[PDB]
Amino acid sequence: AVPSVQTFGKKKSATAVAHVKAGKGLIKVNGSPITLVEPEILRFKVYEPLLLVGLDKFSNIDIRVRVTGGGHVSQVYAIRQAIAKGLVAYHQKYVDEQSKNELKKAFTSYDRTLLIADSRRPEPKKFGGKGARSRFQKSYR
Amino acid sequence: TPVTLAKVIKVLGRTGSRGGVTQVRVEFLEDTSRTIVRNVKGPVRENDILVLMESEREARRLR
Amino acid sequence: GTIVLYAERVQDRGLSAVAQAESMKFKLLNGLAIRRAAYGVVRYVMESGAKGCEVVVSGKLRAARAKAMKFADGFLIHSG
Amino acid sequence: GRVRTKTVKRASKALIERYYPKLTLDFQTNKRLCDEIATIQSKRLRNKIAGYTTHLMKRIQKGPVRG
Amino acid sequence: GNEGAIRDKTAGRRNNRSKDVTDSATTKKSNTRRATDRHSRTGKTDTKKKVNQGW
Amino acid sequence: PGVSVRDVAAQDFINAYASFLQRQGKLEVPGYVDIVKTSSGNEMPPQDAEGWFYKRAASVARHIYMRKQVGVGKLNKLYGGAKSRGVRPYKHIDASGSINRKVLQALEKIGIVEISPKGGRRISENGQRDLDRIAAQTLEEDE
Amino acid sequence: FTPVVLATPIPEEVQQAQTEIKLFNKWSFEEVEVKDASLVDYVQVRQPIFVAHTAGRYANKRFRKAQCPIIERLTNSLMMNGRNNGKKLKAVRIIKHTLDIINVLTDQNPIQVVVDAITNTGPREDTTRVGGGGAARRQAVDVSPLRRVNQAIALLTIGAREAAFRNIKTIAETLAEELINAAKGSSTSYAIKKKDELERVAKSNR
Amino acid sequence: AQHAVILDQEKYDRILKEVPTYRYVSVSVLVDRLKIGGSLARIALRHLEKEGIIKPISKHSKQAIYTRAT
Amino acid sequence: VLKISTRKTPNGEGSKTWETYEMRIHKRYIDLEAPVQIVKRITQITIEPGVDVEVVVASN
Amino acid sequence: SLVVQEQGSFQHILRLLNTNVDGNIKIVYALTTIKGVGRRYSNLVCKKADVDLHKRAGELTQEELERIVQIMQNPTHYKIPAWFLNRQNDITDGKDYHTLANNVESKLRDDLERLKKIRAHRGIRHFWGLRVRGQHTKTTGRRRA
RNA sequence: UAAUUGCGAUAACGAACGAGACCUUAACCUACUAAAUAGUGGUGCUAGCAUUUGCUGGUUAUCCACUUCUUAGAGGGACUAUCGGUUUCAAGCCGAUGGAAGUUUGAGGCAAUAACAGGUCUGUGAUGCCCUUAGACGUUCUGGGCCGCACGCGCGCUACACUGACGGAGCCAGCGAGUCUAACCUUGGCCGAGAGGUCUUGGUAAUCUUGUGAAACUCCGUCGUGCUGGGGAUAGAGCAUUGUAAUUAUUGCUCUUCAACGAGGAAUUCCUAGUAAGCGCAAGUCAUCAGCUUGCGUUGAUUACGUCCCUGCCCUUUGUACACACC
Ligand SMILES: [Mg+2]
Ligand SMILES: [Mg+2]
Ligand SMILES: [Mg+2]
Ligand SMILES: [Mg+2]
Ligand SMILES: [Mg+2]
Ligand SMILES: [Mg+2]
Ligand SMILES: [Mg+2]
Ligand SMILES: [Mg+2]
Ligand SMILES: [Mg+2]
Ligand SMILES: [Mg+2]
Ligand SMILES: [Mg+2]
Ligand SMILES: [Mg+2]
Ligand SMILES: [Mg+2]
Ligand SMILES: [Mg+2]
Ligand SMILES: [Mg+2]
Ligand SMILES: [Mg+2]
Ligand SMILES: [Mg+2]
Ligand SMILES: [Mg+2]
Ligand SMILES: [Mg+2]
Ligand SMILES: [Mg+2]
Ligand SMILES: [Mg+2]
């Protein structure tokens, strides 16, 4: 084949997966391009990495991403992560290191976790309340 | 309206039988060379700055 | 034809809970001082190479009001 | 609160008591040492232990430690 | 029967609504005994010979 | 360059295809439209009155373009929204099986979808065509 | 800024302002400074952001919630009173709208007005119910800077929503309006009235 | 029924001449000049775009925003 | 995993403690190509009190 | 949509179906202030009558008005379902009526009394001032009648 | 210290039960073993648009390959690490750095000795004693009743709207569960506005329902502050589903009727991070019925990170004529 790597990004249940092949600078998510996405208020969340590290950067690669699970926001943070980690995976193998450290350094400076996936997760409700911490309601008498 | 800037130094402890109140010593940096102890309402760490509204009256304990 | 039964005199009954439970049953039911019964069982168990053993008797015995005893020797752990 | 229990502290003592030539303010090697030199059932207790024998060790370099 | 039922006055919301409510509606739990829970009523007691042969 | 429909955002594609089929005439729009409701989890009929059949038709079309095969059941569940059961909690409920299945026929008798094997309905060869066609029409508005 | 285009193409003002300055929805982040001393540190601005939605972790350690971008600290607190718990996208939009309105009126970096509105409403001293034996009097207290920002936010948003309740003007207009009058406190604002009256009673026990 | 649900030739002309000086114009702003209920107000915002002084900064439902033309 | 969630109490008294049990089902399959002999030689033995072995065949 | 002009053509308030209707409110909704005409029914009828739903009750040519009154009291001929209607399959001639305006008052009374005259339990329960449809009357509805 | 958790002090030294360890789940592995019941790239065969190569799909085996994502085996990993402040430089504690992770890592499971006349003889073919035992307190069968309505109390649900209702349109989860001597979960096609009907069909299940296209939510419209289109109680009339039976209306749909409620006195509950709150879903129950429960995921805050003022308990000291122990 050609130069190409696969990476991912996860935020809660959602798991966004990237295939970053060598190519002519596209970036499509699930099936459509990246200049659509929606939530769209959020839109700039996922444009972000490409700005962070300069819009060029991608003209030697094509990027595909497919999100599954998690809700409308869960996915948009998940995807942007897999995009940035996908850049850094490529320059890990196919470019030099000092570029890969150049990239990682400007992601880690701005960062919404972006390279690292966030540990946060729903805590188990326990019997006695509608929630995890939440208790019910007592009245004594 | 003579405002008075004072740099907090050394967190000395909580007062008020409630507990909300905290005792600190300050340092106006509009000429240091002098220091004073105040009561804060909110959360405080060393190197904060308090708008003392009366440069000349300090408070001790709370019940 | 499609099923079969087998007897298998288990290896040392002294470390079978069930064996000793049914023992104490058939002890007291055969008329035996409660202390004698239990303390007996704990002695056969311990002697049978146990690390430790424990016996509770709850219930009402000759008196009207219900009491309950413990009867433990040696080592036990209780958690996890 | 990460106050280390006695079994952690006790085992740690005896390990330094008789294996100071060996062990060295690196949790990693003191870990592997413990596998060889000591019997422990769980991985966590093993770390928890080595982690403290490495503590004790790391400050003995600066004076004695009572016990 | 049903003919009796609607013909019958003394019945239906109108009336009840214009009747005073007893004060026992608003009574508490009555409780009766709990401050006596620990002193046996049997008046009998066991003994110590029957207890000691027992245990 | 070339184009898909994926190249085009949701709203702009459908208000285009809706505008198409009204501009068109070749429809089949049952006739109980305007007197009908679109779900039992709804309160008022569609406000687009004269139209909105073209809205669903276009919506339906684009959806079945996007995937393998999908039928009345799926489409009913998709278009279904929350229903206030009055003083009782909201529950999702499926929407009208007629509206859709008849949009599925009207769009078929017009040749955009074909009763696919495996199941349901799947984008016709000729829809691929026309859908990628007005899609570019929607991009050429911003050229 | 020198153009760049690859396959799937990226819009002009999008390409433009982005790789340049790290500015907001599209708003200048430089300039923008904290008119009252202290109050810096405990008001963000730089690091700069695109929109004020983030997977922050400001809560699991004590003071670090200061390190949240203040503008997001506005929208965060925008989302409440029961119904609107969560609904951050809702908030976000309102703020974007809001800034636009604030900006439209009287020029000025809108987030800079948010800077001037907030700085202007944090009460410099207050009171707590000291024991004093039953009839609990009122000891004045020079209050923390952090609490001074918090209170500012809480105040601003609240009396904005209160006005915004039951009437035509959208929550954004009133949020804008509050900040506007709060820019240099003009006594016609919920927060200033409530600020000063907290200082009214703070001074009135000394 | 407290006024502002219709057109009134005087109101039309009110809209034409009374809308400079609105540093901010919007649904709400239109009702606040003691006139137009929110519905016809929204219709006006549209037909002041047709060729009328207002400059369309920012977008949509609930929120509208315009300034004077330049 | 097969949960069963229950109040502990036989009756109704007391704070409403709940308690859930579970039974873990572990299934697994392995495909082989081997003549009649090895198959049956592999089915009769390799038996175990605890493991439900099942050997289906066929291209359908 | 349209910056409209309109001369004096429109009257605020207007009386039809023996009731009163405010003009400066949208006609779909305006029409609902007749007894027995819910929002849906209002809607379909105007949709039927070739009347503009964007209009107020105000404008509406006098011809257009009368048309509405026509359709409203004859739904079966002017092609409106049957399941769209309040009183279908009567209980005498079993026709499909859409009882309108000051009539629905009397028709509730008619039914209500039909039960009582028949001594049926739902009847009795009505006369006893309670709720019929089988809800618990212990805890709920208290202030009341 | 969360802890008789330790440090220290020290006529004590050194130990065990309990706490801890442990075990379960949620987190991290491009390391290891694999997978047509999970999935990726390439190639076939093939549709659309562009055509200069492109872009977006179709194709349970037309093949070759791989295991990043999914699955679950075995290992690994964290030990509050490195450094630095703080402190009897003790246990520790606080901050920064690194880290999947640094609140017992998060949440549970388990849990010593004791006490209570706590609750359960209405789960038990567990049981003593009492009562009854053929005009039965056994048992079945027919019908009503536990729902009965001047009212007092408690858990809830829906709301009082414009951070909204409605209407189009975008379109996104995770725990589950499903039919043999049977009628369970149901895709698809028709018919019906609807509720539903009818024909077929896959699934004893990572293989089918199901990507459970769930809901808040996001978009563009309509309405405009008017008890309004907020709200949907009460009620009439009709159509359907479960069931042998629906009247005192099991549930469902349609039209209509359109109440109180304009943020709630004194009081009082719950809660510290993926928590609160909002939001729906599956499972229990279940012929039929969820405004309940048990879990689950979605959206995602504000404010503490303190204290002993209130309440609750714990430990000492102290008093005692109490030991059936202040009932
Ligand atoms: Mg334990
Ligand atoms: Mg919808
Ligand atoms: Mg939906
Ligand atoms: Mg709600
Ligand atoms: Mg009406
Ligand atoms: Mg132990
Ligand atoms: Mg793997
Ligand atoms: Mg860090
Ligand atoms: Mg008792
Ligand atoms: Mg029992
Ligand atoms: Mg019995
Ligand atoms: Mg009952
Ligand atoms: Mg309760
Ligand atoms: Mg909506
Ligand atoms: Mg029909
Ligand atoms: Mg079959
Ligand atoms: Mg109304
Ligand atoms: Mg409503
Ligand atoms: Mg159920
Ligand atoms: Mg129940
Ligand atoms: Mg004594």
Cα(first)–Cα(last) distance of chain G, in Å? 60
Distance, CA of H22 to CA of H66 (rounded, Å): 9
With H, G, I as helix, E, B as strand and everything else as coil, classify residue F95.
Answer: strand
Report the alpha-carbon distance of residue A20 to residue E7 in Å, rounded.
87
DSSP state of D3: P
What is d(CA H4, CA H37) in angstroms, rounded to the nearest whole number? 5
I46 touches chain A (CB under 8 A): no
d(CA A126, CA I16): 12
Q: How far is CA F52 from the centre of its chain?
A: 9
Inspect the structure and tell me whether chains E and J have 3 or more CB pairs less than 8 Å apart.
yes
Select the residue of A24, A42, A113 nearest G7 (Cβ to Cβ).
Answer: A24
- Say what the alpha-carbon torsion angle C74, C78, D3, D5 is, to the nearest 10 degrees: 30
Pairing of strands G125-128, G139-142: antiparallel
If you write DSSP's letter for every residue of chain E in order, what string do you get?
-HHHHHH-SS-SHHHHHTSPPPTTTT-------STTTTS-SS-----SHHHHHH-
Contact criterion met (CB < 8 Å) for C65 and E54 = no
User: Looking at beta carbons, which residues of chain H come within 8 Å of J1?
Assistant: 43, 46
Q: How far is the CA of I26 from the centre of ligand 1 (A)?
A: 28
Please name the amino acid found at residue A121. R
Whether C66 and chain E come into contact, CB under 8 Å, resolves to no
Task: Write down which chains contact chain F via at least 3 CB pairs under 8 A.
Answer: A, J
Q: How far, in Å, CA of G193 to CA of G186, rounded?
A: 9
Specify the amino acid at residue G63: F
What is the whole-number distance in angstroms between the Cα of residue I22 and the centre of ligand 19?
21
| Residues 6+ positions from H45 with CB-CB distance below 8 Å | H25, H26, H27, H30, H54, H64, H66
- Nearest nucleotide to the CA of J139, by C1', is K149
What are the boundaries of each domain within chain D? 6-61
Q: Which residue of B40, B44, B47 to mutate against G (max G Cβ within 10 Å)?
A: B40
Instruction: Please tell me which of the candidates J1, J6, J24 has its beta carbon nearest to residue H5.
Output: J24
Cα-to-chain-centroid distance, residue G6 = 39
Helices (H), chain G: 12-19, 70-78, 88-104, 110-119, 145-164, 171-183, 190-203
Please work out, in degrees rounded to the nearest 5, the angle formed at the alpha carbon of residue G19 by the alpha carbons of G16 and G20.
75
Across the interface, whether the CB atoms of H47 and J4 are under 8 A apart is answered: no
- Give dist(CA I23, CA I30) in Å, integer: 23
Taking CA–CA distances from C33, the nearest residue in chain E reads E55
Give me the CA F106–C1' K59 separation in Å, rounded. 27
The ligand placed nearest to the CA atom of residue E33 is 9
Q: Do B41 and G126 count as a contact with CB atoms less than 8 A apart?
A: yes
A27/E4 Cα distance (integer angstroms): 84
DSSP string, chain C: ----------S-GGG-HHHHHHHHHHHHTT---HHHHHHHHHHHHHHTT-SEEE--EEE--SSSS-EEE--EEE------
- Give dist(CA G118, CA G192) in Å, integer: 10
Contacts of F125 (CB under 8 A, 6+ apart): none
Q: Contact, F50 vs F34, CB < 8 A?
A: yes
Q: Are F8 and F51 in contact (CB under 8 A)?
A: no
Looking at the CA of F92, which ligand is closest? 3
Pairing mode, if any, of strands B4-7 and A61-68? Answer: unpaired
* G199/B49 Cβ within 8 A: no
Which two tokens mark J133? 């449809």
- Considering the segment(s) D6-61 as one domain, its CATH architecture is Orthogonal Bundle (1.10)
Strand K bases contacted by the protein (CB, 7 Å): 1-3, 5-9, 15-23, 26-30, 37, 40-42, 47-51, 54-59, 68-70, 72-73, 76-82, 90-96, 98, 100-114, 116-124, 147-159, 161-164, 166-177, 186-196, 206, 210-211, 213-226, 228-239, 247-250, 252-258, 268-281, 290-309, 324-325, 327
Distance of alpha carbon J130 from alpha carbon J123, whole angstroms? 10
Which of J39, J44, J53 shows the shortest C-beta gap to F35? J44
Q: Read off the tokens for F52.
A: 């909105």
Partner residues linked to I20 by β-bridges: I5
How many CA atoms, within 13 angstroms, populate the side-chain half-sphere of residue B45? 7
Q: How many Å lie between the alpha carbon of A140 and the closest alpha carbon of chain F?
A: 28
The partner residue sitting opposite A28, judged by closest CB among G8, G55, G57, is G8
Task: Look at B42 and G139 and tell me if their CB atoms are within 8 Å.
Answer: no
Interface touch G105/H23, C-beta < 8 Å: yes
CB B32 within 8 A of CB B10: no
User: Residue G14: how many CA atoms within 13 Å on its side-chain side?
Assistant: 16
Query: How many residues are given for chain G?
Result: 206
- The CA distance from D28 to D44, in Å, is 14
C-alpha radius of gyration, chain E, whole number:
27
What's the CA gap between F71 and F59, in Å, rounded?
A: 14
Give residue F8's identity as a one-letter amino acid code. V
Note the CA–C1' distance, A83 to K320, in angstroms: 79
Using C1' positions and the CA of F108, the closest nucleotide is K189
The CA dihedral of G107, G111, G113, G115, to the nearest 10 degrees, is: -150
Q: Considering all nucleic acid strands, name the nucleotide whose C1' atom is nearest to the C-alpha of residue G147.
A: K303
- Contact between A18 and A7 (Cβ < 8 Å): yes
User: Are G89 and A41 a contacting pair at CB < 8 A?
Assistant: yes
Experimental technique, in short, is: X-ray
Distance C37 CA to K22 C1' (A): 35
Output the six-digit token pair for B3.
């405002």
Instruction: For residue I49, count other CB atoms closer than 10 A to its CB.
Output: 4
Whose C1' is closest to the CA of A123: which nucleotide? K107
Residues 29-58 of A with CB under 8 A from F: 31-33, 36, 38
Token pair 């403290």 is at which residue? D52
Identify any residues that bridge with J97 across adjacent strands, giving them in sequence order: J87
Q: How far is CA B22 from CA A90, B8, B19, G137, in A?
A: 53, 12, 8, 18
Q: Which two tokens stand for residue A126?
A: 């326990």
| Pick from A76, A91, A85, A79: nearest CA to A41 | A76
Chain A residues whose beta carbon lies within 8 Å of the beta carbon of residue F66? 31
Instruction: Spell out the residues 6+ positions from residue E43 whose beta carbon is closer than 8 angstroms to its own.
Output: none
Residue whose tokens read 């982040």: G29
- Chain G CB within 8 Å of residue H41 CB: no
